[PDB]
Amino acid sequence: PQITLWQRPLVTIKIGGQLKEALLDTGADDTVLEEMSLPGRWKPKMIGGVGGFIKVRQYDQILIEICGHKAIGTVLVGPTPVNIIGRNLLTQIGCTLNF
Amino acid sequence: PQITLWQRPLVTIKIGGQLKEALLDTGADDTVLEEMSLPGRWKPKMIGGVGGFIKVRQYDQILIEICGHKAIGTVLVGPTPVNIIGRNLLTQIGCTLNF
Numbered sequence: 001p002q003i004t005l006w007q008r009p010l011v012t013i014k015i016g017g018q019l020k021e022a023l024l025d026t027g028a029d030d031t032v033l034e035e036m037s038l039p040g041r042w043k044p045k046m047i048g049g050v051g052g053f054i055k056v057r058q059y060d061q062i063l064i065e066i067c068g069h070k071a072i073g074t075v076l077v078g079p080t081p082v083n084i085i086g087r088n089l090l091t092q093i094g095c096t097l098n099f
Numbered sequence: 100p101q102i103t104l105w106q107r108p109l110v111t112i113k114i115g116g117q118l119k120e121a122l123l124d125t126g127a128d129d130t131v132l133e134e135m136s137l138p139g140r141w142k143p144k145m146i147g148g149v150g151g152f153i154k155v156r157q158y159d160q161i162l163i164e165i166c167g168h169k170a171i172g173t174v175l176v177g178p179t180p181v182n183i184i185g186r187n188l189l190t191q192i193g194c195t196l197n198f
């Protein structure tokens with residue numbers, strides 16, 4: 001699809017068998033989701049921007065469906081105020097900026 | 100043009116006659132620039148980041164160019180991790196997300 005930016009570009013995603021709403025975010029290097037369980041190893045990291053930093057757990061090689069597009073990538077999990085899809089997964093679904 | 104997302108979508112902008120590097124950020128509702136001088140009166144504005152909400156300065160009807168595309172709109176000034184071109188100006192220059 002071609003997604004307008006008059007409104008936030010929100011999509012439904014499927015991860016861990018659960019459906020969620022997430023923001024397509026070209027400003028974010030990596031994907032960040034609210035607290036949830038995920039399988040496998042993880043390691044802690046801090047991410048930040050306006051207003052500060054939060055602690056997250058970095059899981060790699062996680063499978064995700066975005067708009068009916070299957071991808072594999074890193075997912076950061078932590079107290080984010082909004083679910084974010086970052087460049088690390090936007091590339092995999094072939095997403096580009098166009099004007 | 101068409102901008103892929105394997106690296107940060109950093110572009111050159113022009114504002115107050117100066118060239119600056121800025122990030123095209125579809126997760127940002129607004130346009131937020133590093134501390135700088137702008138003409139006219141400003142208004143207070145709250146924005147929310149990963150870490151919380153903060154107060155910044157809002158200037159309206161400011162001329163700004165993005166990759167050479169001229170625009171006039173709202174520009175926020177505050178402690179941002181990088182110059183950010185957000186949805187208000189991305190919309191104005193006709194930018195969409197595509198996959």
Ligand SMILES: NC(=O)c1ccc(S(=O)(=O)N(Cc2ccccc2)[C@H]2CNC[C@@H]2N(Cc2ccccc2)S(=O)(=O)c2ccc(C(N)=O)cc2)cc1
Nearest residue numbers: 027028029030047049050126127128129146147148149185
């Ligand atoms: N209202 C506005 O205009 C506004 C909103 C919010 C901001 S922000 O400063 O917060 N900011 C920009 C930013 C932050 C850090 C580096 C480059 C650019 C967010 C917008 N899109 C990317 C950022 N994030 C997603 C997000 C957070 C909050 C609201 C909407 C979207 S995030 O969760 O900070 C994050 C950080 C870092 C990483 C990582 N390291 O991978 C991933 C995710 C600025 C302006």
Ligand SMILES: [Cl-]
Nearest residue numbers: 172173187188
């Ligand atoms: Cl505007």
